[PDB]
């Protein structure tokens, strides 16, 4: 279910009225979702499989599960609803915020260059509506490194100062790092001035109350079996699959930051 | 299969709460209590602009700096006693993101974020109030410049600057004369109000 609205029943009325006005009642809705199917197949030749000195069967049995995990984790993020769970970076429902450019030229012939500065991180992080509860950020480690390696106008470090390296308590800071997300620095080669500047529109970080902004549904774990109908006396076939799904929840509980 | 009576009761109570809170602040006196924001009796403090142009060709732009907040807060007469400030969360977020000339943050410095103890700071945040930043989109330079006269924050001794009077809490009853053998009807209502007390015990800060 879902409570779209509550309505506006009462009103402030004059004491001379004996009657009252009928208010507009609320609205409720019913919603439903599906579960999707993951399937695959691979083939072997009996003679080679028997005479080879390496266990290709178990190698493939491991590779299949690794690929399943990778693909599920990526599909929940950028999938489309046709046959995959629809992702929150694809649905484009979370509000987007753009980072202003920085002028690097003279006052009369300015040069606008896209940029990402330290105070933008604090501005973005502290703007989460308080009523929605606690939230957590997600980033690619290169973004965190680029942020931690900043210096002020005098050459001294921001954040950890007087120390060779800076390493805050991430759990306390409410930041989670995972290299799955897009990387704006392009492997630490971009982020300066001139030709090395960022590219406009690049993804940086996202924040939300996940426990109510996105859901994941579990139905079946992976299974393997031999396909007797294609197996022959000289070559063999296997089949496997699993089922799972996911859907978005409250679109208002999310926030995405991007380079403007 | 879904109970509607309790839903309607909850909606009624929620609407009552929202309407009362809105009226006490910005309500007009016709059929609702008059709020202090609508009355606009508290004396006002403005904010100077800042010249963003060359000295001989000034470009006057409205602004709001860190020291203005301290100046406003520290100038409350001590005779009136305890006082607290109220302002939108975006104002606090815009204030906490300021930097000095070299680039280092003011307030919480050497750390990723600033989160003071508002209970000790004597600040209570409320999103109902006007937001001068326009959803974190205004507050820069040029096209991003503030709009003059925008509300920023207020401070007062509320326990003598405003009063809330309550007479009867809400009640629900069934209208016997309208509920036939195949229908039903319910009625509800309540009475309440408030009035502005001493208008000298408050202050308002605005852009100039």
């Amino acid at each position: 279910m879902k409570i779209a609205d509550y309505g506006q029943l009462g009103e402030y009325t004059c004491d001379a009225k004996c009657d009252a006005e009928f208010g507009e009642p609320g609205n409720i809705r019913h919603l439903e979702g599906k579960t999707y199917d993951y399937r695959g197949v691979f083939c072997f030749n009996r003679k080679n499989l028997q005479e080879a000195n390496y266990d290709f069967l178990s190698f493939m049995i491991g590779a299949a599960q690794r690929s399943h995990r990778i693909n599920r984790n990526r599909a929940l993020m950028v999938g489309d609803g046709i046959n995959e769970p629809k992702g929150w970076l694809k649905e484009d429902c979370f509000p987007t915020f753009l980072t202003l450019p920085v002028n690097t030229g003279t006052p009369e012939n300015p040069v606008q260059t896209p940029a990402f500065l330290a105070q933008d991180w604090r501005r973005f992080v502290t703007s989460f509506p308080a009523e929605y509860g606690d939230a957590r950020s997600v980033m690619h480690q290169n973004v965190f490194g680029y942020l931690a390696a900043m210096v002020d106008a005098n050459g001294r470090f921001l954040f950890g100062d007087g120390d060779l390296t800076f390493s805050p308590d991430l759990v306390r800071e409410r930041i989670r790092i995972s290299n799955c997300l897009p990387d704006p620095t392009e492997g630490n080669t971009k982020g300066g001035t001139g030709q090395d500047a960022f590219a406009a529109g690049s993804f940086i970080a996202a924040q939300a109350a996940w426990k109510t902004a996105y859901y994941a549904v579990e139905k079946r774990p992976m299974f393997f079996e031999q396909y007797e109908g294609g197996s022959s006396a000289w070559c063999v076939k296997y089949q496997f699959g699993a089922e799972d799904g996911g859907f978005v929840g409250c679109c208002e509980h999310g926030r995405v930051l991007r380079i403007g | 299969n879904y109970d509607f009576l309790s839903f309607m009761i909850g909606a009624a109570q929620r609407s009552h709460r929202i309407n009362r809170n809105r009226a006490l602040m910005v309500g007009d006196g016709i059929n609702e209590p008059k709020g202090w924001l609508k009355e606009d009796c508290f004396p006002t403090f403005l904010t100077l602009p800042v010249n963003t142009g060359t000295p001989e060709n000034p470009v006057q732009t409205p602004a709001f700096l860190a020291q203005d907040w301290r100046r406003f807060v520290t100038s409350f007469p001590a005779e009136y006693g305890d006082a607290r400030s109220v302002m939108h969360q975006n104002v606090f977020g815009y204030l906490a993101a300021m930097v000095d000339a070299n680039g280092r943050f003011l307030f919480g410095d050497g750390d990723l974020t600033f989160s003071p103890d508002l209970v000790r700071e004597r600040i209570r945040i409320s999103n109902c109030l006007p937001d001068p930043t326009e959803g974190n989109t205004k507050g820069g330079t040029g096209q991003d410049a503030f709009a003059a006269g925008s509300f920023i924050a207020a401070q007062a001794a509320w326990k003598t600057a405003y009063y809330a009077v309550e007479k009867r809490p809400m009640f629900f009853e069934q209208y016997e004369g309208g509920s036939s053998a195949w229908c039903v009807k319910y009625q509800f209502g309540a009475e309440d109000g408030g009035f502005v007390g001493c208008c000298e015990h408050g202050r308002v800060l605005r852009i100039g």
């Binding site: 002028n103 500065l117 900043m150 210096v151 106008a153 050459g155 630490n188 080669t189 | 070299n102």
Partner: peptide, 27 residues
């Protein structure tokens, strides 16, 4: 359609630069 197996002879992965945030220019 024979599927070839390819790998290079050299061991010089191109030396990628690292670019750090500029000094504190401001808006």
């Amino acid at each position: 359609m024979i599927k070839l197996n390819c790998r290079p002879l050299c061991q010089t992965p191109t030396a990628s630069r690292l670019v750090s945030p500029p000094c504190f220019i401001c808006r």
